[PDB]
Amino acid sequence: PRAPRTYSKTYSTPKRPYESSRLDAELKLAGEFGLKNKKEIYRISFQLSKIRRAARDLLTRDEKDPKRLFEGNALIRRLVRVGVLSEDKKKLDYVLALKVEDFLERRLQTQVYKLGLAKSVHHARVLITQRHIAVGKQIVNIPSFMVRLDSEKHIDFAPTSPFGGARPGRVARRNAARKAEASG
């Protein structure tokens, strides 16, 4: 038959599931970033742990080692392109120094909120998932859309979205029709 379709898990649930400090910290993160489930923080922490394992295995290698240079520059380049890392902290040890807050802050939810198109982070997620926010010039409804370093400048309302200057949605149309019928 057909060659198997490879797949992988994007998170890893933690051992000792029941640490009070861990629960409080993750609920703090969820409350102040609008995350729907602990699965989102688990995925973010798993990506962080994977890139940190890669960074540690990279730092273990001797300096100017060809593999070390290639993989390190690739990793920091993708980190700065995503925007989780910053240009000034271009060294490799800052990858280790990274925290989950950077990845949670480079999300489309919080970036929409920072840009100011939303009243709250939850309002931002609602707007994102109702196909109202559009990166570049295309509608996207991914709250976890990792915005590139050249996309926050072009984050704005969708051309099709009623808040983006298009036809004023459905509820507004219904109420306008009702008002016109009453006034007729």
């Binding site: 060659a3 060809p66 290639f70």
Partner: protein, 258 residues
């Protein structure tokens, strides 16, 4: 398995064919021909996926049947003809002309040539015998047999064969200095010059090959193909001229030509 196998699956296909792993169960199994099932490029993969001329196998078959396509000097109509290493494929209706050749990554390149060079091809003479009636003959890597060769032509040399008629235009010997094409092994596609051979008894022979940038490597003699003089190839080589720079160097070149 109580007979010959007449099927090939995508995973079992050679990697340099570059078939995707998810479009279809099977791979185009090459029919019998001048070259082995591996290290050979079928015309269906040379048209549908290499040149993108036809979108489906049926359209590849239509192209083949209307006789636009001829490998070497003869027209080919089978859907999966095993065009090998130095085979010249014409496509006269579009006036292009390619010669198959390995890029430095280790895959069949799409290197185009002119007709003034397509009028010939080279072949690494793989065996020399005396056929019937005492007549000597040579057989090259594409099964092609030429009778009455020059007595100086021995195994591991290269013979230039005119596509109009099988005849020895000239030959290139196997000795130190000759530019060679590494066709086989980890150095698939690499090009360099020979400094010396090893010539072990019984075991596989070894040759030490250094290139223009003085990157010495070693390869079995069964995977080399001498193609011309010292820095004077008898054929036109694809882009890169058979030099493999490191991964970092490739990335730098890509970003500089971005």
């Amino acid at each position: 398995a109580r007979g010959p196998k007449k099927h090939l699956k995508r995973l079992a296909a050679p990697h340099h064919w570059l078939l995707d792993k998810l479009s279809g169960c099977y791979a185009p199994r090459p029919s019998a021909g001048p070259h082995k099932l591996r290290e050979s490029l079928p015309l269906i993969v040379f048209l549908r996926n290499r040149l993108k001329y036809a979108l489906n196998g049926r359209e590849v078959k239509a192209i083949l049947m209307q006789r636009h396509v001829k490998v070497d000097g003869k027209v080919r109509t089978d859907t999966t003809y095993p065009a090998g290493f130095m085979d010249v494929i014409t496509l006269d209706a579009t006036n292009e002309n390619f010669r198959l050749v390995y890029d430095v990554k280790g895959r069949f390149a799409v290197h185009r040539i002119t007709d003034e060079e397509a009028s010939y091809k080279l072949g690494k003479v793989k065996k020399v015998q005396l056929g019937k009636k005492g007549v000597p003959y040579v057989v090259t890597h594409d099964g092609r047999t030429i009778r009455y060769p020059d007595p100086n032509i021995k195994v591991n040399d290269t013979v230039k064969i005119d596509l109009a008629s099988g005849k020895i235009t000239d030959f290139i010997k196997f000795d130190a200095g000759k530019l060679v094409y590494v066709t086989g092994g980890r150095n698939l596609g690499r090009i360099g010059t020979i400094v010396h051979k090893e010539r072990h008894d019984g075991g596989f022979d070894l040759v030490h090959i250094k290139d223009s940038l003085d990157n010495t490597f070693v390869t079995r003699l069964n995977n080399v193909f001498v193609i011309g003089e010292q820095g004077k190839p008898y054929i036109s080589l694809p882009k890169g001229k058979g030099i493999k720079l490191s991964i970092a160097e490739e990335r730098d070149r890509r970003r500089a030509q971005q």
